[PDB]
Every structure is written in structure tokens, then in C-alpha cells.
Design a protein around this nucleic acid. Structure first.
Ligand SMILES: Cc1cc2nc3c(=O)[nH]c(=O)nc-3n(C[C@H](O)[C@H](O)[C@H](O)COP(=O)(O)O)c2cc1C
Ligand SMILES: [Mg+2]
Length: 308
RNA sequence: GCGUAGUUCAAUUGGUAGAGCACCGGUCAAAACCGGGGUGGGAGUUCGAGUCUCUCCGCC
């Protein structure tokens, strides 16, 4: 059984990847997307998005990390893929599910075939080239054309987020059966994604999709130890350990911090935690109106985890 | 439909805007190399709006 930490732009940066991988057993992390247009991006963009590149593409605890590209033009996906791996990335991921690029490639699977193929030919054969897709644009009727384009490009594996672009993040529309049909169609491995929140949902997803590998995104913020909950049926991280994890986060420094990073990300993480832990509602209200990093850092750090 | 740095572009359910060219500075007029990166106006909601909403303006 494999459990991958999902790419999450504005959420799962290197700091959060560091904190989660310490207390999880994630088999792999994907970075926030590197946006490609018509230009070989400079080295500093890759190091900013993926500081793990300077530790052999690993988090401090040792979990591997993979750079994701979002783009359309094959030549420039290829050249930025070659740079990513040359800098250390363990393979490269192609974004085909972000609402010229992202989910718009799902309208013409030829673009996916052509982009992924150029990336495959640019990256050393044994480093994986993966693709992350949604089921389609507005319906899922072209889902197999999308899947076929990934395989015939020569990609190593396919992550399928089991919704279309229009369905967004609405829970009713999750389609693990569609992922199963893609798995049965393809020779390359298929990784299921969407609405895995705990052990039960991960079991139902693996049972329905037939996938041994899963990827979890928002649930990994809701339950900070979700990989261990999913792999080993362990209980959710107790609330006092969650607060300790947030205290640790306030002590980490973000490079490029324009002043309000922790004001943003403590409140954002608490917003996720608020959907799982009752105690996160009171703590969000305690820090709600704090409008600068020193204050929110002071507020979080002052909590005695021993008395919670 | 779009409007974002001088300009060409980038920016996942709201979390605090970064690349190329141009430009300025440095090493030794220019070159080369190296370093440096403000959301059309206003309003609404929110602790927080490029992002959701209204209004006026501008371009298909
Ligand atoms: C805030 C947020 C940011 C995301 N950013 C990315 C991204 O940069 N690249 C990507 O391929 N998917 C991205 N996704 C999609 C997730 O990887 C994932 O497919 C989706 O959240 C469904 O999984 P889940 O139900 O476990 O959250 C993002 C999702 C969210 C909610
Ligand atoms: Mg966001």
C-alpha cells in the first residue's frame, strides 16, 4: 500500500512538507506547481518551490519529493523537466487538473500526449515521469482518451483525481469507480485521489478503484497524521500534539516571507483542522483578529500543551 | 471574455503577487558575467480579496 502526499498550492510548501513527513509515512510528496510558459525558468524558482532539491530531493526526515510542472508547450515542459531532475528532483509530475495549461489540456488529449512525451524524452529513463489528471472538463466522457494519452506518451504512472473540472471539490461527485476503469484499461500504475479522509474512506476507495496506491490532499491538513491513520488504522493525532505541531510551525522561518506568512498559514491550517477537531474552533477564534506574525506566533507558542 | 511591475506574461475551493525582456548597480563607453522584481479607479463581505461581489472606466 502506497500513500502519496498531494500537491497543494499555497498550503503544502517545504515547511509543511517538513512537519508532516516527520510524523507520517508518506511514500512521496509532490511540490506546488512550477508554472511553465515559453521559457526555461531560472534555477532559483526551482529551489524556492522545492528547497528539498538541495538535500537530494528529500525532506529532512527522508521522504522523497517530486517537482510538478504546469504548462502546455512541449519544448518548454521538456527543458524545465530536464532542469528539475538535473537539480535533484526524483522524477517530474505534469499538472493536467488545475482549474494555456492545467485542466484545459483535458479538452485536447493530444496536448497531454505531446507534453508528457517531451518530458519523458528529456528526463533520464529510470526517473519517473508522472501525470496528474482530473476525469475531464465538464463531463467524464473523454476520460479514457486522457488516460490513453498518458500511457502512450510513455509516462511512468497516472494520478487520477476522481472528478471533472466543473465538479471542483464537491463531495457528492467523487467517482472512484471511474478511477477503477482507468486502472483496468492501463498497463502503467494508477493512483487514486479524492475524498480520502480516514481509514474507512481509504478502504472503500481502494476496494472500489482497485488501487493499492492512493494520494491524499486536504485530509492531510484535517488529520496531520493521516498516512498512519490510513496505513495502520491508528487514531487521529491527539489535539495536544496538533497544537505542538502548530507551535513548531511558528518557529520555522519562510524564505521570501513578505511579513504575514504565519498569519496566513496558521489561520489556513486551523480552518482545515476546524472540520475534524472541535477544539480547533475555539483556537481559531482566539487568533482570528491577530494581524501580524509576531502576535500570532506569540499566541500559539504561549499555549501549555500539558494543560490541554 | 479580459484589464496585474516600464513592457510580455505568471499566480487551485480567499491566506497576503514572481518570471523573461527593458532598466539600474557591480566585476573588467559597449559587451560578457554577476546582483537588484506593483493587481484600471472606488466600494461591499471577511481577521485577510489578484481570487467572491457591486459600481464606474478601458480593450476584444
Ligand atoms: C488548496 C489546494 C491546492 C491544490 N494545488 C494543487 C496543485 O498545485 N497541483 C495539483 O496537481 N493539484 C492541486 N490540488 C488538487 C489536489 O492535489 C487533489 O487532487 C485534490 O485536493 C483532491 O484530493 P483530496 O480530496 O485528498 O483533497 C490542490 C487542491 C487544493 C484544495
Ligand atoms: Mg488558496
Amino acid at each position: 500500500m502506497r500513500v502519496l502526499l498531494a500537491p497543494m498550492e499555497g498550503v503544502l510548501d517545504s515547511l509543511v512538507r517538513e512537519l508532516l513527513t516527520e510524523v507520517n509515512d508518506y511514500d512521496l510528496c509532490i511540490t506546488e506547481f512550477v508554472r511553465v510558459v515559453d521559457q526555461l525558468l531560472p534555477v532559483k524558482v526551482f529551489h524556492r518551490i522545492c528547497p528539498e532539491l538541495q538535500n537530494a530531493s528529500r525532506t529532512p526526515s527522508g521522504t522523497l519529493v517530486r517537482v510538478q510542472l504546469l504548462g502546455q508547450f512541449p519544448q518548454w515542459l521538456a527543458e524545465n523537466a530536464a532542469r528539475a531532475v538535473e537539480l535533484g528532483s526524483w522524477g517530474v509530475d505534469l499538472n493536467c487538473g488545475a482549474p494555456g495549461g492545467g485542466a484545459t489540456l483535458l479538452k485536447d488529449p493530444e496536448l497531454i500526449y505531446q507534453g508528457a512525451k517531451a518530458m519523458r524524452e528529456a528526463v533520464p529513463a529510470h526517473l519517473p515521469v508522472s501525470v496528474k489528471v482530473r476525469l475531464g472538463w465538464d463531463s467524464g466522457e473523454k476520460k479514457f482518451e486522457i488516460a490513453d494519452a498518458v500511457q502512450q506518451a510513455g509516462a511512468t504512472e497516472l494520478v487520477v483525481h476522481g472528478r471533472t473540472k466543473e465538479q471542483g471539490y464537491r463531495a457528492e461527485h467523487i467517482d472512484w469507480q471511474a478511477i477503477g476503469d482507468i486502472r483496468q484499461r492501463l498497463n502503467i500504475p494508477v493512483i487514486a485521489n479524492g475524498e480520502i479522509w480516514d481509514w474507512q474512506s481509504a478502504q472503500q476507495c481502494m476496494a472500489i478503484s482497485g488501487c493499492d496506491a492512493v494520494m491524499i490532499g486536504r485530509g492531510a491538513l484535517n488529520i496531520p497524521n493521516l498516512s498512519r491513520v490510513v496505513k495502520y488504522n491508528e487514531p487521529r493525532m491527539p489535539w495536544p500534539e496538533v497544537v505542538a505541531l502548530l507551535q513548531k510551525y511558528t518557529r520555522l522561518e519562510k524564505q521570501g516571507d513578505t511579513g504575514l506568512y504565519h498569519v496566513a498559514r496558521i489561520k489556513q491550517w486551523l480552518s482545515y483542522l476546524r472540520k475534524e477537531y472541535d477544539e480547533a474552533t475555539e483556537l481559531f477564534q482566539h487568533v482570528r483578529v491577530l494581524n501580524n506574525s509576531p502576535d500570532i506566533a506569540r499566541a500559539i507558542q504561549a499555549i501549555d500543551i500539558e494543560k490541554l
